[PDB]
Structure formats: C-alpha cells, structure tokens
Design a protein around this ligand. Structure first.
Ligand code: LMI
Ligand code: ZN
Length: 225
C-alpha cells in the first residue's frame, strides 16, 4: 500500500486533524465551511469519546466534502499488534462508518506515525488504498505545548504541498489556530484541499470510500460498550 506524506498538486495545502471527532468539532467544521476549506479527519472509534456519539458531526463532515479516514478504533501502537489485532482495530472503525455513513474508508493514518510491514500487509488485505503520514507538525500536542501564537507563526512558513498534522481534541487548535491560519494560507495563494485531492488522486468525495449499504438509523448497536 502506498505511503504518502506530501501533496503533489501545485498550490495545495492539507489541513489534517487527528483523534476526533470531539466537543469542538461543529465549530471547527463551521470555520472550515465558511471559507470553503476542506479538512482531512483521521478519526478514532473509542478514544476521546465514542464515534457513535459523534454521528451527526460525522454526517455533516461526510456530506460537506471533507475527507474521513481511519486512525484505528482504540488509537493503538500498531507496531505492537498482531495481524489479527490490527485487522480488528481497523474493522471496528469500518463498521461504525458503515452503520453511520453507509461506507468503508479507503485510507488511514497510524497512531503515533508508527507502522511496519504487518500494518502495510493488513491494509493491503483489507482493501486500503493508502497510508497517510504528514510533513509538518503544528506542535499542538507537544509537551510543553507551544502557544497558539507560536503555532500560527509556524504556519506562516509552511510551504505549498504541506500535509499538516493537527489534533481536533485541542481546544486552541479549533478556536485560535485554525481561524487564524485559514486566511493566512488562502490569502497567500494556497488551496485548502483534502489529502486525496492534493495527491492528485480524486477530488470526488465518493472516490475516497467504498459504499457498502444504506446508512443505518441509530439503534442499540450504536455503542462503544
Ligand atoms: C498514550 C498517548 C496516546 C496519550 O500518547 C502517546 O503515547 N504519544 C506518543 C507520541 C509519539 O510517539 N510521537 C509523536 C506523535 C505523532 C503523531 C501522533 C498521533 O497519533 N496523532 O494523531 C502521536 C504522537
Ligand atoms: Zn493520534
């Protein structure tokens, strides 16, 4: 399975967000949508909330041209897992997306940026088309953590074709950094694209997923317990 860390489209720039959705996600998506900016979201199943509790955010995201991909169910260190454990960690996110959205993801980003040959083999066997890394880190999960002002200033020098790592579980990323950096990036000529678009893969959202069935209605299976 191909590994990607840099966009190819001239002028493109990918704002990407891990570990969500979260309690600030409707604000984040409103900010992106107001600027016609597209985000790439690498979601968990049970990590900072249960994916089924975020079904409405997920449906908005899915229907507004944002890219949704897997970050594993439990945010595991994938190099420590057996083939079977990793398959289960991916399957569980696939199943949530099937129930909520009717589709399976075709892409994923490994927690901690950690992957090996077992990970790549599982992704191949499960039909994934790519493993998505990044090439600039906002620093929003560094510890000690840089200030929002510092992170915004770093964004002023991230070049074209950046795939930037952010975490939407950080309130200041949603409320301070992204509202400041969207105009910085758009006004200097960058196109805020999803990762598949910026890789010269498809710009059609339907090409980022595999349709399985019609979206389900919430029932007692929509649980992480
Ligand atoms: C147990 C918990 C989960 C609390 O934290 C950790 O152990 N962190 C280990 C940090 C690390 O090794 N490298 C830097 C890094 C890059 C990307 C990601 C990631 O997954 N972004 O979404 C995480 C870390
Ligand atoms: Zn993560």
């Amino acid at each position: 399975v191909p590994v990607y860390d840099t966009c190819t489209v001239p002028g493109s720039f990918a704002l990407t967000f891990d570990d969500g959705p979260y309690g600030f996600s409707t604000r984040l998506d409103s900010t992106l949508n107001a600027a016609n900016a597209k985000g790439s979201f690498f979601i968990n199943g049970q990590n900072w909330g249960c994916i089924y509790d975020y079904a409405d955010v997920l449906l908005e995201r899915f229907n507004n041209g944002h890219f949704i991909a897997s970050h594993t169910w439990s945010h595991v260190h994938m190099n420590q897992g057996t083939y079977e454990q990793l398959s289960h960690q991916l399957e569980l996110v696939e199943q949530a997306m099937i129930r909520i959205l009717g589709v399976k993801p075709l892409y994923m980003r490994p927690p901690y940026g950690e992957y090996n040959d077992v990970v790549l083999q599982v992704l191949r066997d499960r039909g994934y088309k790519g493993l998505i890394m990044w090439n600039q880190d906002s620093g929003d999960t560094f510890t000690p953590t840089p200030s929002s002002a510092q992170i915004i200033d770093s964004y002023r020098s991230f070049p074209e074709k950046t795939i930037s790592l952010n975490h939407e579980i950080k309130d200041f990323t949603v409320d301070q950094v992204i509202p400041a950096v969207i105009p910085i990036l758009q006004q200097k000529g960058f196109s805020l694209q999803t990762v598949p678009e910026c890789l010269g893969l498809s710009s059609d959202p339907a090409d980022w997923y595999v349709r399985v069935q019609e979206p389900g209605t919430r029932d007692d299976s929509w649980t992480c317990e």
